[PDB]
Amino acid sequence: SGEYPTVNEIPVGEVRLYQIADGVWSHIATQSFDGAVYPSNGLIVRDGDELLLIDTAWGAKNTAALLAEIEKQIGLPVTRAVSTHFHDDRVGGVDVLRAAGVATYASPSTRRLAEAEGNEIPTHSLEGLSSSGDAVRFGPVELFYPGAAHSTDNLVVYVPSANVLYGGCAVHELSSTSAGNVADADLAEWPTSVERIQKHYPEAEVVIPGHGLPGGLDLLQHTANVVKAHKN
Numbered sequence: 001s002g003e004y005p006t007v008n009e010i011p012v013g014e015v016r017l018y019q020i021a022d023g024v025w026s027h028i029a030t031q032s033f034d035g036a037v038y039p040s041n042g043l044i045v046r047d048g049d050e051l052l053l054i055d056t057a058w059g060a061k062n063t064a065a066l067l068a069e070i071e072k073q074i075g076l077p078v079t080r081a082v083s084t085h086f087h088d089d090r091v092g093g094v095d096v097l098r099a100a101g102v103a104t105y106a107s108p109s110t111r112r113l114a115e116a117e118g119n120e121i122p123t124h125s126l127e128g129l130s131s132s133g134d135a136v137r138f139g140p141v142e143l144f145y146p147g148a149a150h151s152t153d154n155l156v157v158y159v160p161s162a163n164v165l166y167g168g169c170a171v172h173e174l175s176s177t178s179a180g181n182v183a184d185a186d187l188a189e190w191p192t193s194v195e196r197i198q199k200h201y202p203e204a205e206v207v208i209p210g211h212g213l214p215g216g217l218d219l220l221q222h223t224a225n226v227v228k229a230h231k232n
């Protein structure tokens, strides 16, 4: 009823949307992994009379429910999707998207890692993002590669019209104690990549993590703090 949704407010197999700003929503879904339940976020950005989707809802059935919730709450067609790294919470559901007519995109690094690991593979390669600090425009957003952090391929997304910074899994929520799933992370490089984000987007008003509650710019410094602590 207005609060940011958690696993405890999202019915089973369900997706919820949350209005972040004019023409900007996050999507929230729940998934089980190795016997524990986790929330995860993605982004929806209005693109004229179409929508740009950032990240799947972590699974085929969750992503089908995401498309149904978008039709219910927004009613504009999702025409393109970007996955911000290769893990299942970002690409799981790309096959559903592709079969619904959505053009799916990711960096060549993400596509290679997804293919190697047996995850679903976005169709189109996003060039111009292979060097740390690189940025490219994609519809109503800017895509930014900050360097290795949560994964070597992780991208962040900025919505300039609303100063919304979607950090993906390279950014953690304020309540977080540890650095999440670090299986593919570069803990030594992560603080430097977060510094790049801070330097590039100092006017960000809302910061959205890959999992958990959005907040302000404080999420960036907090993420660096928890990552250095985990590393130590």
Ligand SMILES: C[C@@H](c1cccc2c(-c3ccc(CS(C)(=O)=O)c(F)c3)c(C(=O)O)[nH]c12)N1CC(CN2CC(C)(N)C2)OC1=O
Binding pocket: 033, 038, 087, 088, 089, 117, 150, 169, 172, 173, 175, 176, 177, 178, 179, 180, 181, 182, 183, 184, 210, 211, 212
């Ligand atoms: C599918 C993904 C995955 C699954 C389950 C949980 C997470 C979490 C996570 C965990 C805890 C917290 C609370 S907290 C910050 O601690 O307070 C949290 F907010 C996020 C993250 C993340 O943090 O982004 N990602 C997760 N996976 C899988 C994976 C394993 N790897 C792939 C392989 C073969 N390549 C082996 O690595 C990954 O990221």
Ligand SMILES: [Zn+2]
Binding pocket: 085, 087, 089, 150, 151, 169
């Ligand atoms: Zn991940």
Ligand SMILES: [Zn+2]
Binding pocket: 087, 089, 169, 210, 211
């Ligand atoms: Zn994640």
